[PDB]
């Protein structure tokens, strides 16, 4: 949304840190009432500890004139009433006029304006989003056009009701330009698809005309490509009521609704194809491990990993299950201890008095 | 143009008090920090140093 001018004005005219305005927050610092850190103020040097005390006790009166006017000139830019580069000129001009004529009434009215203008910037955003201007002009155009008097059928009235729906239901770039002499309709701000809304009088002739079953190109194929664009745009915004068995325009709106419905089905299908196409008790276990590893190296002299594997597969299931985390830790330390030096490893195995050194633990 | 200034003269002239990073408007600090590479504004504001 459009940023609030008063907040933005205070974002460039007020001390970032503490000022006389933040008196209530200042007093909390100088008396350790802050939940964040109460002992901060106590530790300051005496020079900037007293200067903070003096200001809090006797606040210093300031001049809010420049802050108020900066709020107004910030608001004027957001409504584009002045160019952004003109902001420097206007700021100094208004300031001078207020100086030349300052007084209490003036100062108070500047204050009303500040509030008023905040609300005004809001009004504008809301209005630009609602897009109400277009509705106001669809109505002028409708008025120009002879309404309520079609010779063939009065589903043309129902068609007009669909026109107001489209302008209402398309908040984005709902525009009805007055034009030089004719009114125009569009959907996107880039105007890639526009209509000469005064040239839809071809539709005026073809109201109630029964649709030829045979061919689209016939004597009734009097629709200018400008007119068929109007039907294409309003097709998603018109529901039933213009009977399929009714006028040729009634039939085309059904075809466009399905064609648009086919396109959104096709859009989902295409993206999926493209993505796919582009693609105590423990110590007893320790004694067994020392003997089992030593015995297996005696009979075979296999690798330490193989020796440990054969040791683990010949244990009591109750012993293995109960101390399963310990065994895995015991094997890893024994494997790396043999990896460091086997001569010391043989001594450890051949020493039943051996106990894990600390560091096994942690 | 505020002719008077009743705040203490040792914090009004920035002999001791807040430093530039915390007494200018946050719009100016954010502006000055963005363009430090070219046309710096660092040497144009006092920074108190209190022992």
């Amino acid at each position: 949304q459009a940023p609030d001018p008063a907040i933005r004005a205070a974002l460039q005219s007020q001390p970032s840190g503490l000022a006389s305005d933040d008196w209530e927050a200042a007093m909390q610092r100088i008396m350790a009432l802050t939940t964040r850190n109460p002992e901060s103020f106590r530790q300051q040097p005496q020079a900037n500890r007293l200067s903070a005390i003096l200001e809090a006790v006797v606040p210093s009166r300031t001049n809010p004139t420049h802050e108020k006017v900066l709020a107004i000139v910030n608001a004027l830019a957001e409504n584009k009433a002045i160019r952004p580069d003109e902001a420097g000129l206007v700021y100094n001009a208004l300031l001078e006029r207020v100086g030349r004529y300052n007084s209490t009434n003036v100062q108070s009215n500047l204050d009303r304006l500040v509030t008023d203008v905040r609300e005004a910037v809001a009004q504008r955003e809301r209005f630009k989003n609602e897009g109400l201007g277009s509705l106001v002009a669809l109505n002028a155009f409708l008025a120009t056009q002879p309404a309520n008097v079609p010779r063939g059928q009065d589903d043309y009235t129902n068609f007009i009701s669909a026109l107001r729906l489209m302008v209402t239901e398309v908040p984005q770039s709902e525009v009805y330009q007055s034009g030089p002499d004719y009114f125009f309709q569009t959907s996107r701000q880039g105007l890639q698809t526009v209509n000469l809304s005064q040239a839809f009088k071809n539709l005026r002739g073809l109201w109630g005309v029964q649709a030829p079953v045979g061919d689209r190109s016939t004597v009734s194929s009097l629709l200018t490509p400008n007119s068929r664009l109007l039907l294409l745009l309003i097709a998603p915004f018109t529901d039933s009521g213009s009977v399929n068995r009714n006028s040729y325009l009634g039939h085309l709106l059904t075809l466009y609704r399905e064609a648009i419905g086919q396109a959104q089905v096709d859009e989902q299908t295409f993206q999926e194809i493209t993505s796919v196409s582009r693609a105590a008790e423990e110590e007893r276990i320790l004694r067994y491990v020392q003997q089992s590893v030593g015995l297996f190296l005696m009979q075979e002299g296999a690798t330490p990993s193989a020796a440990l594997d054969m040791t683990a597969r010949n244990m009591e299931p109750s012993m293995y299950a109960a101390n399963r985390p310990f065994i895995n830790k015991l094997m890893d330390y024994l494997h790396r201890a043999a990896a460091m030096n086997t001569d010391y490893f043989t001594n450890a195995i051949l020493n039943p008095h051996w106990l894990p050194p600390p560091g096994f633990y942690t | 143009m505020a002719t008077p200034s009743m705040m203490p003269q040792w914090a009004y002239m920035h002999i001791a008090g807040q430093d530039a990073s915390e007494y200018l408007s946050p719009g100016l600090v954010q502006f000055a920090r963005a363009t430090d590479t070219y046309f710096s504004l660092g040497n144009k504001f006092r920074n108190p140093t209190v022992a």
């Binding site: - | 008090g17 807040q18 430093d19 022992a51």
Partner: peptide, 26 residues
């Protein structure tokens, strides 16, 4: 939080937590 360090207006000067130190001939 022993703040007996020089100030920079406010917000005491500086200090990197990691800086006590080592060097040898290597």
């Amino acid at each position: 939080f022993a703040s007996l360090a020089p100030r920079h207006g406010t917000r005491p000067f500086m200090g990197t937590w990691n800086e006590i130190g080592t060097s040898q001939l290597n």
